[PDB]
């Protein structure tokens, strides 16, 4: 519960030529710059996405929660990304049908108790349907505002 560090440049819009590896690069990059995670953090996130996919077939737009073991995280951090086109992420529950994804929540948590709590709260925010509709229109400066307000409440 050692605080989820958030900055402005931890939110960015991604172009249309991005694949699954391109996303994990762009979202991790600010986290390794600020010493949040190890140098090869994108490697360990990609490795876990191959073994445990994080595609979520939520309505109306699917999402992905790419993360890794808390062993490769120095400080708790979050990185957000919005995609211009739906990118295929494999289903997390096991259905062979993939999931189109436009919003991606890279989670960088450092200990097991924080992974279970943040992941549980994430399940509630993706069910905020009227919020899953406005995430695709807010720009990189404002997406901060709404999404950071729900981080400052977690300290409860």
């Amino acid at each position, epitope marked *: 519960m050692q605080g989820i560090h958030f900055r402005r440049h931890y939110v960015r819009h991604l172009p249309k030529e991005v694949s699954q590896n391109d996303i994990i690069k762009a979202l991790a990059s600010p986290l390794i710059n600020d010493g949040m995670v190890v140098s090869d953090f994108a490697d360990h996130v990609i490795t876990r996405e191959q073994n445990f996919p994080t595609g979520l077939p939520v309505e109306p737009v699917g999402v992905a929660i790419p993360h890794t073991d*808390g062993e490769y995280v120095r400080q708790n951090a979050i990185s957000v990304g919005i995609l211009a086109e739906p990118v295929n992420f494999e289903d997390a*529950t096991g259905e062979p049908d993939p999931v189109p994804v436009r919003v991606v929540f890279m989670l960088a948590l*450092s200990n097991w*108790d924080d992974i*279970t709590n943040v992941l*549980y709260w994430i399940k509630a925010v993706i069910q905020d349907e009227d919020f899953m509709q406005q995430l695709l229109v807010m720009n990189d400066d404002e997406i901060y505002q709404s999404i950071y307000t729900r981080i400052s409440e977690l300290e409860h």
Partner: antibody
Framework: EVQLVESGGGLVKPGGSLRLSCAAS????????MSWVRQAPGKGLEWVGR??????????DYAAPVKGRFTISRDDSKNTLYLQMNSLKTEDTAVYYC??????????????????????WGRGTLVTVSS | SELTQDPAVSVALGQTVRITCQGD??????ASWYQQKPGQAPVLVIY???NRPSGIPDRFSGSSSGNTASLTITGAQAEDEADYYC????????????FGGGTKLTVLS
């Protein structure tokens, strides 16, 4: 390939103290969680306690009948786990096992802090508390 | 304790058997299953949502319903005759672990 060896069991008078050790080989002991489970002769398994890795804060938890009396401490430098038993009672007579604890959390149907399972089990050391 | 099992269950060789574990905390957490042969240390069989370690036959499978958890052996073999224990949290919100009473499986082999 994974091996867990327990030692230190013996006869102890009621109210005495005993220390158990657990040698871990075949994995990264520094990152894995560790539990102690005991089984009285002819009875079922009973969870004693668990220590987390230094990554996850190194917290320790204990069952009600042993809280305060038993203490779990790890030593990543030599890949060994310890169980310090104080104020031993007749009820503590059991085969004590050393188990590597795994972590699990289902995203869609799980509740924090998740579930803990025991993958690899040592062979067990016998502790007898009797006058 | 919190988790309760059937003390003894017998099954014919090559048929299906269900061992049940009942507890209040099972409404919030999954249960793992452990097989203990006589004179041997326990071994993990089913954990989480039907997760099975490497080297465990595919006839072993776990499930859950309300406040109960189940271990199903499809076509029981002689090697499956042992004692079975369920493990889960003691109550909701806890970080402690609790084992079930245990079940003695008898495979009429």
């Amino acid at each position: 390939e994974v091996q867990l060896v327990e030692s230190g069991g013996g006869l102890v008078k009621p109210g005495g103290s005993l220390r158990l050790s657990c040698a871990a080989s075949g994995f990264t002991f520094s990152n894995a969680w560790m539990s102690w489970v005991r089984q009285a002769p002819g009875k079922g398994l009973e969870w004693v306690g668990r220590i987390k890795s230094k990554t996850d804060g190194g917290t320790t938890d204990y069952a009600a009948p042993v809280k305060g009396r038993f203490t779990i401490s790890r030593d990543d430098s030599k890949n060994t786990l310890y169980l310090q038993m104080n104020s031993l009672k007749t009820e503590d007579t059991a085969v004590y096992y050393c188990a590597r604890t795994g972590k699990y959390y289902d995203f869609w149907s799980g509740y924090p802090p998740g579930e803990e399972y025991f993958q690899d089990w040592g062979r067990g050391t016998l502790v007898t508390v009797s006058s | 304790s919190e988790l309760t099992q059937d003390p003894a269950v017998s099954v014919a060789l090559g048929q299906t058997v269900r061992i049940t574990c009942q507890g209040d905390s099972l409404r919030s957490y999954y249960a793992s299953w452990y097989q203990q042969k006589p004179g041997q240390a326990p071994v993990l069989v089913i954990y989480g949502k039907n997760n099975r370690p490497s080297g465990i036959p595919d006839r072993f499978s776990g499930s859950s319903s309300g406040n109960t958890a189940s271990l199903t052996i499809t076509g029981a073999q002689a090697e499956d005759e042992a004692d079975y224990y369920c493990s889960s949290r003691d109550k909701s919100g806890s970080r402690l672990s609790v084992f079930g009473g245990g079940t003695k499986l008898t495979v009429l082999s």
